[PDB]
Each structure stands twice: as C-alpha cells, then as structure tokens.
Write an enzyme that holds these catalytic residues in place. Structure first.
Site, PDB file in Angstrom:
ATOM      1  N   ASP A  72       0.690  -1.219  -0.066  1.00 31.05           N
ATOM      2  CA  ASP A  72      -0.012  -0.203  -0.042  1.00 31.05           C
ATOM      3  C   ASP A  72       0.992   1.140   0.056  1.00 31.05           C
ATOM      4  O   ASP A  72       0.713   2.173  -1.066  1.00 31.05           O
ATOM      5  CB  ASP A  72      -1.018   0.007   1.255  1.00 31.05           C
TER       6      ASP A  72
HETATM    7 MG   LIG Z   1       0.189  -2.986   6.135  1.00 29.23          MG
END
Ligand SMILES: [Mg+2]
Ligand SMILES: O=c1ccn([C@@H]2O[C@H](COP(=O)(O)OP(=O)(O)O)[C@@H](O)[C@H]2O)c(=O)[nH]1
Ligand SMILES: [Mn+2]
Length: 238
Positions: A187
């Site tokens: 992410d």
């Molecule tokens: Mg994470």
C-alpha cells in the site's frame, strides 16, 4: 455504481464475515464490492459463501498454490490490479478481510469527493483496538494534507477518483506495484506512485477499525518505509 470497493481475502476465516458485513450494511449503498480471494482454505470460503447472494458482490478466486506462486508477486497488489481492470465505479476504495468499515464511511468519503472537485485522493483517520477486553486503543489521525503518504496512511483508509489510476499507469506501467520486493508495504508503494502527482486530503473522522488480539523465507529482501519517504522528500512536491 458510483463506488468500486476492492477487498482482498486470504485465510482469515475468523474475521472476514465482519469485514464483508460492514461493507454491505453501509448507509451509502451504490457500490460494487469485489471480493478477490487468493485461493483460501475451505473454512474461509465457507464463511464468504453466503455473502455471494448479495447482488453487489463480484467474487473472484485465484488459482494460486504453493510457495513459488505465493512469492512471485506481491499478491494483494496483483489482485487489486485485476479488480481495477474490471471496475465500473467513479470512485475507488480498498478493504481487507480483517478491517471493518464504520457505517457512514462510504457516505462521508463520497460526499467529500463530490463536494470538492479539486481533491482527487482522500484519507480518513483509522483506529485499532488491542484485545486481551480492550487493553490499548490506537488512532492514526488525518489532520493535514500530505504529499508523503507512504507508511503514514493505511490501505483501508483511502478513497480516490478513478482518474488517479490513469495518471499512475501512464508513468509507471501498472496501478499497484506487483514486485515482491514491496510485499510488506505494498500500500505504501502504491501511495508512493500516487504521490508523484497528487497529495492526500484528510477527512478527520475514524472511519475504519482494526481488531488485534516457507513463505517468508522465499521473498526477496524487503524494501522499507524510510526509502520511500526519503525518495518523496527528495522529490519535493510539497
Ligand atoms: Mg500494512
Ligand atoms: O497470499 C496472500 C496473502 C495475503 N493477501 C491479502 O493481502 C492483504 C494484506 O495482508 P495481511 O493482512 O497478511 O498483511 P498486513 O496486515 O501484514 O499488512 C489482505 O487482504 C490479505 O487477504 C492475499 O491476497 N494473498
Ligand atoms: Mn492484516
């Protein structure tokens, strides 16, 4: 649909029903929910099964099996890329099998983007409850506009316009980075790509919650947060 919610699932049978239920009961109901299961065990698939009767769910199961295939790519980035290619929503958001949305999360994020055309990426605050009852409560605030999101903002706390995906793909060739050198912090690596072009705008409310109560040996050396953060500071966009 207005929103495309992309959830990744892999063997969290004790948590996945609470996650999916939290999305299906949202007060903003105009979404499609991709449930991208990475070929989980029987217990997990049986917990997910009843939710496939909800007409907004789009369930995809990979064929992935074994340490070679599990470590060839950062799996959740590959599955998110697969969902993005099928997404129909104007706004994109992410979910995991062990994170819970607060009931008004989609309504509030959609309203922030509908109201401010100049914002392309928004992030909310996030809370984690440590159980052992609650022994500890952690909050990750959303108090400032930031050009340096890697490792400061989680996967599950963001919503962005689909058009952001276009710019990213033009400079980098893909949306999320599937390289397995970014397995622990995928992410963050996607946010690092987005931060070449867009800042993240804060929505100061706790809209997602976490409850905390051979594979690793076959990954390449994991790149870290400090590397991405220093790279953006050097880039000097804000
Ligand atoms: Mg994470
Ligand atoms: O082979 C795998 C392992 C994990 N995941 C998904 O990757 C996301 C992040 O995984 P995890 O919770 O293990 O990571 P962490 O909390 O350490 O960031 C979750 O949605 C998992 O379901 C996946 O799709 N395939
Ligand atoms: Mn997790």
């Amino acid at each position: 649909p207005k929103v495309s919610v992309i959830m990744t699932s892999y063997n969290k049978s004790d948590y996945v029903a609470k996650s999916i239920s939290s999305i299906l009961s949202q007060t903003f109901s105009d979404f499609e929910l991709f449930i991208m299961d990475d070929n989980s065990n029987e217990e997990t698939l049986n917990v997910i099964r009843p939710f496939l009767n909800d007409n907004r769910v789009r369930f995809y199961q990979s064929d992935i099996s074994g340490v070679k295939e599990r470590t060839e790519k950062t799996r959740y980035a590959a599955l998110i890329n697969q969902a993005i290619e099928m997404a129909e929503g104007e706004y994109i958001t992410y979910a995991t099998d062990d994170n819970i949305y607060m009931p008004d999360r989609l309504l509030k994020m959609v309203r922030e983007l509908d109201t401010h055309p100049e914002k392309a990426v928004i992030y909310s605050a996030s809370k984690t409850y440590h159980l052992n009852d609650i022994v500890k409560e952690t909050v990750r605030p959303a108090a400032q506009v930031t050009w340096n999101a890697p490792c400061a903002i989680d996967h599950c706390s963001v919503m962005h316009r689909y058009s952001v995906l276009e710019k990213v793909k033009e400079k980098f060739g893909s949306y999320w980075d599937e390289s397995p050198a970014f397995y622990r912090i995928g992410d963050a690596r996607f946010f690092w790509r987005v931060n070449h072009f867009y800042p993240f705008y804060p929505l100061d409310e706790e809209l997602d919650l976490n409850y905390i109560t051979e594979f690793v040996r076959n990954l390449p050396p994991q790149r870290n947060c400090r590397e991405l953060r220093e790279s953006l500071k050097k880039l000097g966009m804000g």
